[PDB]
Amino acid sequence: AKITTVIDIGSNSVRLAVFKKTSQFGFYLLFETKSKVRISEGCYAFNGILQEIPMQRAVKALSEFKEIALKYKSKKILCVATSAVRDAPNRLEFVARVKKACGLQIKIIDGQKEALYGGIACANLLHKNSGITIDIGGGSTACALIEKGKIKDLISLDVGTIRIKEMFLDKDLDVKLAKAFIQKEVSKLPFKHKNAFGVGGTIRALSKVLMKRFDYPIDSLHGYEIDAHKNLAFIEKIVMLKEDQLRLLGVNEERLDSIRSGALILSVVLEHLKTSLMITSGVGVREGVFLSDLLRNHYHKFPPNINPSLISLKDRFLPHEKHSQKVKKECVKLFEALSPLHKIDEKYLFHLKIAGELASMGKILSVYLAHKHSAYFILNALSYGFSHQDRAIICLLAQFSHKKIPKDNAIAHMSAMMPSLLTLQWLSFILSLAENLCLTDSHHLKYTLEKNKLVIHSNDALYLAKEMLPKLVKPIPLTIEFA
Amino acid sequence: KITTVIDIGSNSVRLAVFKKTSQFGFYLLFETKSKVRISEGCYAFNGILQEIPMQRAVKALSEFKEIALKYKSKKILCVATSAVRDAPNRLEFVARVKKACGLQIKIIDGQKEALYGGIACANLLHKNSGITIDIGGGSTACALIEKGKIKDLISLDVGTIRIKEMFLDKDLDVKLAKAFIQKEVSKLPFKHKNAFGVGGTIRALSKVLMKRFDYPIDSLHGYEIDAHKNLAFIEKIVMLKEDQLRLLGVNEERLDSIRSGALILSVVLEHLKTSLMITSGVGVREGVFLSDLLRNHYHKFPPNINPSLISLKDRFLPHEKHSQKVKKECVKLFEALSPLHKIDEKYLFHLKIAGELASMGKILSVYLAHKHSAYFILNALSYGFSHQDRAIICLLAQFSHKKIPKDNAIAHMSAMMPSLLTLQWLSFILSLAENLCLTDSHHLKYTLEKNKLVIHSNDALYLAKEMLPKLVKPIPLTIEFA
Ligand SMILES: Nc1nc2c(ncn2[C@@H]2O[C@H](COP(=O)(O)OP(=O)(O)O)[C@@H](OP(=O)(O)OP(=O)(O)O)[C@H]2O)c(=O)[nH]1
Ligand SMILES: Nc1nc2c(ncn2[C@@H]2O[C@H](COP(=O)(O)OP(=O)(O)O)[C@@H](OP(=O)(O)OP(=O)(O)O)[C@H]2O)c(=O)[nH]1
Ligand SMILES: [Mg+2]
């Protein structure tokens, strides 16, 4: 199925995602939208029976979601329901009510499945292979233990923002009564880990709060790293704030009644799991349901050296991948020939190779400032499987091709673990020289290094490359000659 | 599908690869150059082509052939200009090229060269009438355009490299070159308030003016220059030393030719009584292509066709259904609300294009999709649009469902830009149009009852109703569904 729509009927909101499959492993999120139905509204005081008005709202919203799915020419519609519907004595009635109204066939999924799908997404679409997911929802909280890309255990707890809200916070009971309740369920988590994968809207909201609190330069939620110990106190503080204080931190109006109880869950879980680093995730159950279908024969895992966002990016903007692969190859050969001089850690080949593939991607938009554009595409769309540093490095190499990288760059200094300015100049220089030598259809290039002289061997004239040699920015005094 | 054009100029050899994405849709896929300068030292020998510049030219064009093939060109159009057409050994140099790489150079005369420039400026600029100024290495072409149709063609024998090696390399008084250029410019039989600057010299000078004023948009095409106001500065360029030119941003390879070129421009501008010069990023190369693409259309695009807008949609909006609906509702809401915002009907032009392209950037990422859209618009919506057009459309898309900041740089890029309250109105209308078009609902009808917009429809419009609070209204305004 080329175009696949995924509908997620949660306890707090109703969400829709349209996925487009560009190649075997290539895909990208084509369209997203939401509705704040909150089908669980007022149900926790009546044994989880879905009330009449929320069901009417859910039907009206799900009917237009079906319309949206069809105008995108969807070949497959996967619809799932979670905690609030799971627990509802009248779940069958609501499922059949939706089918009669718009045709959608809701598939109620158990709390373990809900946890599994989240783990599948994080294990394939994040830049770390080991850790525990934390998917705080309206009615339940899921956790999936992941070790080296494989899911080793799963837990589902019956604590949730709207559940805690309607049980304790709307009755204005002391928070310690709501805190105790959550701890009693969190104790049922049989694992610990230094890493955490933050999943769900509540955590995306708290992630935005911190991104604002630290003036983060990169405006991408997926991959955002959060020191758990340093911010644990700040997260608990959010619980006791009034509505006006939450607005000043950036919390949307529609999250004001739920984020307080949400922060409380997250703070109790972070303490129990002994987390020290939480990575914000932008994917969850929705993406998991899709990946479970996409990677049916590959054990729900991507083959090694297969990144979905890198591939789909080339599928969308580089259908003719021939030129970009030669540039990448020459980047490796030069990196090796020059290794005695630059002594750069081999780990940056990863970033240099990708920069070579994508250096000219931006030409699809304009040949002028093309590298600027490619750097723009990279920083904003190269998400799955890359850290924010990985984007920054890859971004800068392409951006400053044939140019000198300034010393006051905001992105280059986003962290102390970033490579030196000399390393970036070295890498970008290599990229630049490679682009010049691949301008023609030259083959069998060989490079040799002497004390300080790079010698380029080839049977071709390489007239243009030779003419363009002055306009390269060298990292150090260096001589370049053509045999 | 893919057409390459090779321009054998007097100062440089140029290669451009064009991709045709539809009937009228095209975009420049790749470009490069070589500084062969085949005319080096030719003006002393009545135009004879020297050996070294010919061997360099052969080597370069042979690799321009290699490039054209690896881009899968079905057509390779090659033209030669002044320096090559004035030589006594033209036929021989053309033979060595065809021998060495298989290219068939077509020598074109001055009239033909002015035409190709006029064809490009007549189709790819945001003004319909004016005079082109194509200052090259050995000639200066001028075409008269009236309502997009070419009326007269003239070719002058003044050029950068020419004026350089005849006057400026010999360290004589500048007034001698000005007199020579004046006597040759007098041949121009027309005048006009609009001039279209073409060629690398003028692009280099425009780049200098942009830096001087700290311009916020980094696109050359469509840059407007006040001729009277900037004439004196252009004249001063002539008397500057190279180190002074470097601080102005002039690259090394233009240092030897920008002074003579500046002098030519100051005389042409003065003689044509030019009031507005529009920098053109397109020239002879684009004319050759448009001549082949618009062969059955009298070398001009229909007066409803923008090849930039189109190509931008061919590249990123193959399925055009949703966008056309949003545009339609943008017009209806605009007219229905006119008693409240009282905005000049000329701004419908922008709101409609913003409505077509508001969601374009979703092909890069659904997150921050509207910003991506603005980025595309501001950097690639070039042919047939002014910079203000770009700026306005860019801002409408960018700040959908948002409040436009008061200190926005693009909003203040000019004093003629619309007010912030106007931009807020258009952005708000776009936003409402987007919500009402989310589903496939039809037959929307609007009525205004003293600040009350009433949206009439038979469909539930559930989602549109729920999203209403997230709109940023430009003024206190009531909106209700019937
Ligand atoms: N799943 C997911 N969502 C993302 C990601 N990045 C951003 N979003 C969400 O998409 C919506 C758009 O936020 P922006 O990207 O800043 O675009 P916008 O503000 O101009 O509307 C927001 O949801 P919202 O309107 O604040 O409501 P909510 O969905 O956050 O509860 C935002 O939190 C991501 O990586 N993954
Ligand atoms: N024909 C045309 N050219 C444009 C246009 N816009 C920019 N250019 C030229 O393209 C080349 C790329 O310079 P930039 O656009 O700044 O991109 P870059 O700095 O990263 O190389 C420059 O030519 P250059 O390297 O300075 O040498 P030259 O070709 O200008 O003489 C620039 O003047 C345009 O609209 N039309
Ligand atoms: Mg959920």
Please give the full DSSP string across B25-54, using - where no structure is assigned. Answer: -EEEEEEEEE---TTTTTTTTTTPPPHHHH
- The verdict on A5 and A134 lying in the same domain is no
- The verdict on A271 and A347 lying in the same domain is no
Of A432, A444, A430, nearest to A334 (Cα)?
A430
B280 CA to middle of ligand 2, Å? Answer: 12
The three-class DSSP label of residue B131 is strand
Q: Does B442 touch chain A (CB under 8 A)?
A: no
Q: Which residues contact B108 (CB under 8 A, 6 or more apart)?
A: B79, B80, B81, B85, B116
Final residue before a domain boundary, out of A78, A109, A140: A109
Q: Which residue of B has its CA nearest to A378?
A: B364
- Rounded to whole angstroms, the Cα distance separating B18 from B89 reads 31
Nearest to B439 among A67, A221, A464 (CB): A67
- The verdict on A343 and A475 lying in the same domain is yes
Nearest to A67 among B219, B375, B440 (CB): B440
- Rounded to whole angstroms, the Cα distance separating B195 from B142 reads 9
Helix (H) / strand (E) element for A480: namely strand A479-482
**Number of domains making up chain B:** 3
Final residue before a domain boundary, out of A109, A130, A162: A109
Residue type, B31: E
**Phi, psi angle pair for B464, to nearest 5°:** -55, -40
Residues in A closer than 8 angstroms to B481, CB to CB, are none
Helix (H) / strand (E) element for A6: namely strand A3-9
Rounded to the nearest 10°, the torsion over CA B273, B276, B282, B285 is -10
Q: Would you report the helix, strand and coil content of chain A in percent, each value rounded to 5? A: 50, 15, 35
- Rounded to whole angstroms, the Cα distance separating A401 from A435 reads 9
Best of A368, A404, A471 to mutate for ligand 2, by most ligand atoms within 8 A of CB? A368
Q: Does A321 touch chain B (CB under 8 A)?
A: no
Within 6 A (CB) of ligand 2 lie A 368-369, 371; B 33, 200, 203, 220-221, 251, 281
> Buried (b) or exposed (e) across B422-435, using 16+ Cβ within 10 A?
bbbbbbbbbbbbbb
Residues in A closer than 8 angstroms to B249, CB to CB, are none
Name beta bridge partners: A135.
A142, A199
From residue B15, alpha-carbon distances to A468, B3, B27, B251, B284 in Å are 15, 11, 14, 20, 11
- The verdict on A258 and A364 lying in the same domain is no
Name beta bridge partners: B226.
B276
Asked if residues A246 and A240 have their Cβ atoms less than 8 Å apart, the reply is: no
Pick from A64, A312, A363, A462 the residue to mutate for testing the B interface (most B CBs within 10 Å).
Answer: A64
Q: Which residues contact A268 (CB under 8 A, 6 or more apart)?
A: A179, A182, A183, A186
Asked if residues B80 and B106 have their Cβ atoms less than 8 Å apart, the reply is: yes
Residue type, A468: M
- The verdict on B254 and B394 lying in the same domain is no
- Rounded to whole angstroms, the Cα distance separating A332 from B65 reads 28
Long-range contacts (CB closer than 8 Å, 24 or more residues apart) made by A234-242: A234/A210, A235/A206, A235/A263, A235/A266, A235/A267, A235/A270, A236/A263, A236/A264, A236/A267, A238/A206, A238/A209, A238/A263, A239/A175, A239/A263, A239/A264, A239/A267, A240/A175
Q: Could you give the count of Cα atoms lying within 13 Å of B86 in the half-sphere of its Cβ?
A: 21
The three-class DSSP label of residue B144 is strand
- Rounded to whole angstroms, the Cα distance separating B125 from B256 reads 30
Residue type, A294: L
Asked if residues A471 and A402 have their Cβ atoms less than 8 Å apart, the reply is: yes
Q: Which atom of ligand 1 is nearest to the CA of B367?
A: 15
Name beta bridge partners: B145.
B130, B150
Q: Is the dihedral angle over the CA atoms A385, A388, A391, A393 positive or is it negative?
A: negative
Q: Which atom of ligand 1 is nearest to the CA of A220?
A: 6
Name beta bridge partners: A419.
none
Q: How many interface pairs between A and B have CB atoms less than 8 angstroms apart?
A: 96
A355 CA to middle of ligand 1, Å? Answer: 28
Binding site per annotation, positions of B: 11-12, 14, 33, 71, 113, 127-129, 134, 193-194, 200, 203, 254, 285, 322, 366
- Rounded to whole angstroms, the Cα distance separating A66 from A341 reads 60
Nearest CA to ligand 2 atom 4: B281
To the nearest 10 degrees (0 to 180), the angle between helices A228-239 and A256-273 is 140
Edge-to-edge strands, sheet with B75-80? B26-34, B13-20, B2-8, B75-80, B106-107
- The verdict on B197 and B320 lying in the same domain is no
Of B394, B385, B384, B463, nearest to B426 (Cα)?
B394
E-strand stretches of B136-226: 140-146, 149-156, 194-198, 224-226
- The verdict on B150 and B268 lying in the same domain is yes
- The verdict on B10 and B133 lying in the same domain is no
Nearest to A60 among B365, B382, B460 (CB): B460
Helix (H) / strand (E) element for B74: namely none
Contact A63 B368 (CB under 8 A): no
Contact B363 A63 (CB under 8 A): no
Q: Compute chain A's Rg from CA coordinates.
A: 26
Contact B31 A367 (CB under 8 A): yes
- The verdict on B143 and B224 lying in the same domain is yes
Contact B439 A68 (CB under 8 A): yes
E-strand stretches of A245-325: 277-280
Tokens representing A184 are 């009693």
Q: Is the dihedral angle over the CA atoms A90, A96, A102, A106 positive or is it negative?
A: positive
Nearest CA to ligand 1 atom 5: A282
Contact A380 B368 (CB under 8 A): yes
Residues in A closer than 8 angstroms to B70, CB to CB, are 322-323, 441
B481 CA to middle of ligand 2, Å? Answer: 52
The whole-angstrom distance between residue B474's C-alpha and the CA centroid of its chain comes to: 33
Q: Which residue of B has its CA nearest to A222?
A: B367
Q: Which domain holds residue A362?
A: 294-483
Nearest CA to ligand 2 atom 6: B220
- Rounded to whole angstroms, the Cα distance separating B177 from B171 reads 11
Nearest to A463 among B63, B322, B363 (CB): B63
Q: Compute chain B's Rg from CA coordinates.
A: 26
Q: Which residues contact B197 (CB under 8 A, 6 or more apart)?
A: B132, B133, B203, B205, B206, B225, B265, B277, B278, B279, B280
Q: Does B31 touch chain A (CB under 8 A)?
A: yes
Nearest CA to ligand 2 atom 9: A368
Q: Does A450 touch chain B (CB under 8 A)?
A: no
- The verdict on B298 and B243 lying in the same domain is no
- The verdict on A332 and A416 lying in the same domain is yes
- The verdict on A35 and A142 lying in the same domain is no
Final residue before a domain boundary, out of A61, A84, A109: A109
Of B112, B152, B110, B116, nearest to B131 (Cα)?
B152
